[PDB]
Structure 1
Amino acid sequence: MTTPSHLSDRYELGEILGFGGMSEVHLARDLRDHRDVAVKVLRADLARDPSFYLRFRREAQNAAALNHPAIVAVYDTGEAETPAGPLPYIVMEYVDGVTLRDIVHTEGPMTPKRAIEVIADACQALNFSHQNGIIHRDVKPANIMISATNAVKVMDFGIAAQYLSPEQARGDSVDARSDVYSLGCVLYEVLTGEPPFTGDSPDSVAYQHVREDPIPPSARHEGLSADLDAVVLKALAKNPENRYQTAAEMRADLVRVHNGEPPEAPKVLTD
């Protein structure tokens, strides 16, 4: 089973760009609008599996279409009839670049200034989203890309364990502060090279989000300041009331640190 060369007589697929647990993402030429796009298609090896097919459809009707320089646009959704059966897809803005998951794996931790810049730009995407009534819900390294021209692109908004917030783990209500906490997880990882919590199972990692304090970034990797510790650990506070309340507030503290000014986050002491 493979993915077809064309979808709906309009998209002509080229190189495979990436994959995840459900989907493959291909560069395509949109023959109708003369545009390069990324087409996210249900995985060919999973496309006949009812659980994955239905999940793909349930998620496509919720994938948020937002218009912002820092957010991957969603152009359309569709489904191709192949000789093996229906193959649903979503057409979106193509990013020529790498995900943060790619970068941390291949290059290790980013310099702190660069991590700060990238996460600060991600805050602006989240801020825009929240203002528009959309919680991201799945902020994680594979959902943030840096393009070949160094622009930050955040993607896959609005679809309801290393990056779960405590409230998601508990099945409580999730709101913008959930995104703040998950972005804190990503920040932690680009800074140290590791997510804040690892374990044998998803459930063990979820348990840690709920009950255990992260080890301060400065203890996990050299060259990280106490000021950065304070920002990261505030984003990762267990109680939503103790985090940054908005993506904008998190960004304001990141900007402070970028400019060598003291963050407003509570100080954190080690040793």
Structure 2
Amino acid sequence: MTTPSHLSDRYELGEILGFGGMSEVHLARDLREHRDVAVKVLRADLARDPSFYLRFRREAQNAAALNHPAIVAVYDTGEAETPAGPLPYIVMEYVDGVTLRDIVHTEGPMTPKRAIEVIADACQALNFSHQNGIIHRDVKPANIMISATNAVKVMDFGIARNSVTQTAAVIGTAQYLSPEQARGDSVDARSDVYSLGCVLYEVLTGEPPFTGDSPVSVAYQHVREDPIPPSARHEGLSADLDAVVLKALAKNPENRYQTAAEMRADLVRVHN
């Protein structure tokens, strides 16, 4: 058993770039547009399972196509009539690089200058998404990629405004959940501000603001426990930078940065 060589007469599949939960991403050639693309597909071993097909079909139908330099573009979606059944696929902008999750794990904590530039570019992507009526809801280091040319690329934006059902963002490690998401309170753009603050905290210190043995313990910490200032967790971090991270990580959304664009302006001021 194997993966098809082509998804329609247009996409010639190459090497596997990585794996998700139920998916695999292949480097592919767009034979029509004459370009390299990344094709996210349901894993070949799960393709014959009707439950995974139904879950991945929704994901392909909900993949948002946003055109911005700091957002992984979605060029096409479809379903290949594979000899092993229907195979849904998402055609994306190929990113030759690694996730922020990979960098924190292998390289460790980033320098203050680079970490600021990464998060400032991520703010631009979130601002554009919010201007298109889309709250990301799942901002985490794994959803931010850094290219070979050091370009920041945010991925996994959903179609937001018969509408297709979305999965619960609450499932996972809970380390990047906002207090309102963990509680089931109203969610607005300031939730992405909070989650990006968690990412900014991790790239600066080498660890997320809250850690625990269970997702309940981490969610509890997000809601009630105050985060330790980044300078106290990692050396060489200014009080001005500490004020930015801790403002984004405020419990009440009212005390956070009200917009992603506002968070970017304060980061650029610290960058000077």
TM-score, structure 2 as length reference: 0.90
Checking the alignment, whether the CA contact within 8 Å between 1:180 and 1:247 is kept in structure 2 is: yes
- TM-aligned CA distance change 1:160 to 1:206, over 3 Å: closer
Which residue of structure 2 lines up, in the alignment, with residue 30 of structure 1?
30
Distance in 2 (alpha carbons) for counterparts of 1:62 and 1:76: 12
Confirm or deny that 1:178 pairs with 2:191: yes
* Aligned-residue offset at 1:20: 1.6
Sort the Cα spacing of 1:2 and 1:105 in 2 relative to 1 into closer, same or farther, 3 A.
farther
Unaligned runs of 5+ in 2: 159-171
Deviation at 1:59, TM superposition (A): 2.3
Q: CA deviation at 1:112?
A: 0.6
What does residue 13 of structure 2 align with?
13
Displacement after TM superposition at 1:201 (Å):
2.3
| Stretch moving more, 58-67 or 133-142 | 58-67
CA 1:2/1:195 → structure 2, altered by over 3 Å: closer, same or farther? farther
> 1:100·1:146 contact (CA, 8 Å) conserved in 2?
yes
Q: Per-residue CA shift, 1:173-225, capped at 9, x if unaligned?
A: 21110110110111011111111122222232222222222221112111112
- Deviation, structure 1 residue 45: 3.4
**152-161 or 220-229: bigger deviation:** 152-161
Q: CA RMSD in A?
A: 2.0
Q: Distance in 2 between matches of 1:222 and 1:52?
A: 46
Q: How does 1:83-122 map to 2 (within 5 A)?
A: 83-122=83-122
Q: 1:93, CA displacement in angstroms? A: 0.7
State how far apart, in whole Å, the 2-side matches of 1:148 and 1:25 are: 18
Contact 1:25 1:40 in 2 (8 A): yes
> How many percent of aligned residue pairs carry the same amino acid?
98
8 A Cα contact 2:60 2:78, kept in partner = no
> Are 2:25 and 2:39, in contact at CA under 8 Å, matched by a contact in 1?
yes
Distance 1:77 1:221 in 2: 43
Partner of 2:40: 40
- Report the 3-state secondary structure (helix = DSSP H, G, I; strand = E; otherwise coil) of the residue aligned with 1:45: coil
Contact (CA 8 Å) 1:137, 1:160: kept in 2 or not? no
Give, in angstroms, the shift of residue 49 of structure 1: 4.0
**Residue 212 and residue 52 in structure 1: after superposition, are their counterparts in 2 closer, same or farther (change >3 A)?**
farther
Distance 1:10 1:154, change over 3 A: same
Where does structure 1 differ by over 4 angstroms across 4 or more consecutive aligned residues? none
What CA distance in whole angstroms lies between the structure 2 residues aligned with 1:205 and 1:98?
A: 26
**C-alpha spacing 1:256/1:55, structure 2 compared with 1 (3 Å):** same
Note closer, same or farther for the CA distance 1:22–1:105 as it changes in structure 2 (3 Å cut): same
Deviation string for 1:128-174 (max 9, x for gaps)? 11111111111111111111111111111129922111111112221
Q: Which residue of 2 aligns with 1:134?
A: 134
Question: Could you say if the C-alpha distance between residues 73 and 6 of structure 1 is closer, same or farther in structure 2, counting changes exceeding 3 Å?
Answer: same
Distance in 2 (CA, whole Å) between partners of 1:36 and 1:84 is: 26
> Could you tell me which residue of structure 2 aligns to residue 226 of structure 1?
239
Name the structure 2 match of 1:155. 155
Q: Distance in 2 between matches of 1:112 and 1:240?
A: 25
The alpha-carbon deviation at position 9 of structure 1 amounts to 2.5
Matched pairs, number? 259
Q: Find the aligned partners of 2:210 and 2:47 in 1 and give their Cα distance.
A: 32
- C-alpha change, 1:212 and 1:47, in structure 2 (3 Å) is farther
> Is residue 27–residue 36 contact of structure 1 (8 Å, CA) maintained in 2?
yes
Higher mean C-alpha deviation, range 221-230 or range 244-253? 221-230
- 2:173, 2:215 within 8 Å by CA — same for their partners in 1? no
* Deviation, structure 1 residue 117: 0.5
Query: How far off its partner does 1:26 sit?
Result: 1.1
